[PDB]
Design an enzyme around this catalytic site. Structure first.
Site, PDB file in Angstrom:
ATOM      1  N   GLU A   1      -8.625  -2.577 -10.666  1.00  0.00           N
ATOM      2  CA  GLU A   1      -7.966  -2.399 -11.954  1.00  0.00           C
ATOM      3  C   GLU A   1      -6.629  -1.684 -11.867  1.00  0.00           C
ATOM      4  O   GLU A   1      -5.709  -2.020 -12.606  1.00  0.00           O
ATOM      5  CB  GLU A   1      -8.881  -1.644 -12.922  1.00  0.00           C
ATOM      6  N   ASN A   2      -6.523  -0.698 -10.982  1.00  0.00           N
ATOM      7  CA  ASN A   2      -5.268   0.035 -10.828  1.00  0.00           C
ATOM      8  C   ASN A   2      -4.159  -0.913 -10.384  1.00  0.00           C
ATOM      9  O   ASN A   2      -3.061  -0.909 -10.948  1.00  0.00           O
ATOM     10  CB  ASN A   2      -5.422   1.168  -9.802  1.00  0.00           C
TER      11      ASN A   2
ATOM     12  N   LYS B   1       2.504  -4.529 -15.242  1.00  0.00           N
ATOM     13  CA  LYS B   1       3.631  -3.716 -15.682  1.00  0.00           C
ATOM     14  C   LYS B   1       4.891  -4.256 -15.001  1.00  0.00           C
ATOM     15  O   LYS B   1       5.972  -4.269 -15.595  1.00  0.00           O
ATOM     16  CB  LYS B   1       3.403  -2.246 -15.299  1.00  0.00           C
TER      17      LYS B   1
ATOM     18  N   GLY C   1       6.654   6.073  -8.211  1.00  0.00           N
ATOM     19  CA  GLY C   1       7.611   4.987  -8.190  1.00  0.00           C
ATOM     20  C   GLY C   1       7.788   4.279  -6.858  1.00  0.00           C
ATOM     21  O   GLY C   1       8.616   3.374  -6.756  1.00  0.00           O
TER      22      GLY C   1
ATOM     23  N   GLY D   1       5.520   2.350  -5.231  1.00  0.00           N
ATOM     24  CA  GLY D   1       4.953   1.011  -5.272  1.00  0.00           C
ATOM     25  C   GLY D   1       5.967   0.083  -5.916  1.00  0.00           C
ATOM     26  O   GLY D   1       6.179  -1.037  -5.455  1.00  0.00           O
ATOM     27  N   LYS D   2       6.603   0.560  -6.985  1.00  0.00           N
ATOM     28  CA  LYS D   2       7.616  -0.222  -7.693  1.00  0.00           C
ATOM     29  C   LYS D   2       8.747  -0.585  -6.735  1.00  0.00           C
ATOM     30  O   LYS D   2       9.219  -1.722  -6.732  1.00  0.00           O
ATOM     31  CB  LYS D   2       8.186   0.562  -8.887  1.00  0.00           C
TER      32      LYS D   2
ATOM     33  N   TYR E   1       0.692  -4.451 -11.347  1.00  0.00           N
ATOM     34  CA  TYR E   1       1.340  -5.763 -11.293  1.00  0.00           C
ATOM     35  C   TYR E   1       1.761  -6.274 -12.677  1.00  0.00           C
ATOM     36  O   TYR E   1       2.855  -6.820 -12.835  1.00  0.00           O
ATOM     37  CB  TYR E   1       0.424  -6.798 -10.625  1.00  0.00           C
TER      38      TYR E   1
ATOM     39  N   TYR F   1       0.784  -1.224   0.000  1.00  0.00           N
ATOM     40  CA  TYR F   1       0.000   0.000   0.000  1.00  0.00           C
ATOM     41  C   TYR F   1       0.814   1.271   0.000  1.00  0.00           C
ATOM     42  O   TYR F   1       1.778   1.389   0.745  1.00  0.00           O
ATOM     43  CB  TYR F   1      -0.872   0.036   1.252  1.00  0.00           C
ATOM     44  N   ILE F   2       0.404   2.227  -0.825  1.00  0.00           N
ATOM     45  CA  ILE F   2       1.050   3.524  -0.869  1.00  0.00           C
ATOM     46  C   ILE F   2      -0.069   4.519  -0.578  1.00  0.00           C
ATOM     47  O   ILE F   2      -1.173   4.399  -1.119  1.00  0.00           O
ATOM     48  CB  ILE F   2       1.665   3.839  -2.249  1.00  0.00           C
TER      49      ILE F   2
END
Length: 173
Positions: free
Chosen positions: A135-136, A143, A105, A107-108, A141, A96-97
């Protein structure tokens, strides 16, 4: 700058507040306030999180931006996984962000940290479960290289929803 830190027993209170805020802001729209209140109390109460933080097969990490807490990730291995996937996998159970820190960046960073832990733990694959309506998160994921390998129904409140199982194979050497 961006920095991550492994959560300890002293981070219990902060973890609890961050967990509640980010979770509420994620399932608030599709759930009754009554169901949300009950879950928040059973999932993020002091005792539950204290147990999870003390679990040898679980690990929590905070991510910061300019010394400010921006989000967290919780990973599980072996028996700590929410599904019996085995001793060759790692699960990203929670990631979670905070809304205001999204799209930068972070979450990445958290996901790649989970991948790094899996590689270091010599796990063959990494996986996670994600609500089909999110969906977000699904797009994020995909990506990051994850692919849907399955899907099963689960109960949200008093109605069934679909959980997508997404995964990626790592080092096999």
């Amino acid at each position: 700058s961006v920095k991550m830190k492994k959560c300890s027993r002293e981070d219990l209170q902060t973890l609890q507040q961050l967990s509640i805020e980010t979770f509420n802001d994620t399932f608030k729209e599709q759930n009754s306030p009554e169901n949300m209140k009950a879950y928040l109390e059973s999932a993020f109460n002091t005792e539950q999180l204290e147990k999870e933080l003390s679990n040898m097969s679980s690990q929590f990490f905070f991510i910061y931006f300019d010394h400010e807490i921006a989000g967290y990730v919780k990973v599980n291995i072996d028996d700590a996984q929410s599904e019996e996937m085995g001793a060759e996998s790692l699960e990203i159970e929670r990631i979670y962000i905070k809304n205001s820190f999204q799209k930068h960046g972070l979450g990445k960073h958290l996901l790649n940290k989970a991948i790094e832990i899996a590689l270091e733990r010599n796990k063959k694959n990494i996986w996670l479960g994600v609500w089909e309506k999110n969906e977000n998160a699904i797009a994020f994921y995909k990506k990051m290289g994850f692919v849907q390998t399955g899907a099963h129904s689960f109960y949200m409140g008093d109605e069934e929803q679909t959980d997508l199982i997404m995964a990626k194979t790592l080092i096999l050497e």
